Amino acid sequence: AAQTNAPWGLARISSTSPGTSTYYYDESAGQGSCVYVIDTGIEASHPEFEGRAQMVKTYYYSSRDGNGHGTHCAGTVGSRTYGVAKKTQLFGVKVLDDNGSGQYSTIIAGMDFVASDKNNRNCPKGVVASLSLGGGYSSSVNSAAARLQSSGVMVAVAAGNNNADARNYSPASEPSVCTVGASDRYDRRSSFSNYGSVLDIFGPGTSILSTWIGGSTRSISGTSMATPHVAGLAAYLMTLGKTTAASACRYIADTANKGDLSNIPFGTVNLLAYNNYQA
Template structure:
């Protein structure tokens, strides 16, 4: 019997798009990230009647995020312009400043040798020599801190904060009510504890005062940076959650746009390939080490970890002034971001692939102890920048 379709027959409808659900512990019920096929118009016939997008994306992905009823979701699942749908999920900061108390101390502007992390990244081996003397400062480069904001009044950043963006509608704007973003910014570019102490810093606030944010918000932050980045530019995202194809696609697209992106591997001692955006292609994923050149016990592991940097008991800028310390891969990633800024000032605005190759090739191999099998033993090195 012939299998040729008869003239005038209609092709059967395509199967509904599968909805990828987040783990129950982090999923946001009724809220979805929708990615559209290239060329589809978010505001055209795609958005179902009654659905108001929370965020729309145009640069890093083509799509939107919205709350939807089951009926509205089913409308989208059969729409020919829809490429993928996933349940939105919560992501978190991958490290926290210690609470106020005896560990807090006010530190006047001083040599960067007050930070063992800075001291470690400019030498191949221990013992530490209490020096950090980079040739360059990151001047002319802008670092986009995709985080909880930055303390606008902190003197560590005086004269170098540039406009940013907030996806968190709580009245704080891009100001930091958590302290995490101020710490990571201090490591990238603080006057005292920063790798690149003349870099410009832009707060892209995607995490709330509790340290959490939806992937839909984080993607909106990536999208804003892709649209507004003043280059040469680097970006740091010391956050993550369960693996998300949408978040990974957004992080990769930001990197492909010419913004070097460094992200934290995560703090659960699990495979970073199950975490986003740590598992995204073409971003730099950073695990953590200790002052004794030991792999940090909390750091995520595996083939998605591109390199390791200081991340335990790290000193940096404190929300409200002075200094604080904390542990987490959140504080390892900004060291690599800072070195990325030094690279771009030194050599020019190379594409992300070139920056990645240089940073990884410059690492110090096999100097750390306790690195799990399957994780590269590669320690960040600033290589005289």
């Protein structure tokens, strides 16, 4: 299928050149896959989720997203106008509050919860998780992302927005997950994007239009916004049966658009998430 005047990031992961405005994808659109969005929550009521989004855990008063961050990345994963896997099931795991500031112990707990909660669900095609959160280095946050990964979830985390080597950041520095970087609509590395050897793939992270709280939309920029693109890509490529939860990070990397990106510091992968869709 095709999506005309799609948000530039969607169009980018379906072509080998920037500037284009059409998002091409296979009709499956990630049906039968689930993506746990681990963030500030999901306004499941948003018409762009079409009843495919639901909150399954919070670590605060409400399951309601009073921030917008989680609703945005849930939207980029699988909302209908702004999502990569537009048919996927989304599961809100609220580890950040409505300020976007979740303790390491809470983020560890939400990751251990997903690793268990996935057994309660019906995700025949595979389980994905999108961690648009971040933070300084910690073995315990790293270990939790790895446990979540080895438990059969495809974990995509953000490299962080500190214009630094991502190895000083968790869960970004965990080797066994998919540390996603951010690029912009001109195939540059994003101005804030972290980098380093641990980075596995780059995504559209600058000026990402997606859903927002209050039934609205909003365009915002961060490696936090490039993470759902790959997460939705993984959910999409898993529903296609082209990859599994444990190999989806390196399939997207094998099948990436290499050399396309500018200002990729030496020793960092120059790979852009690309669904390689044809007909």
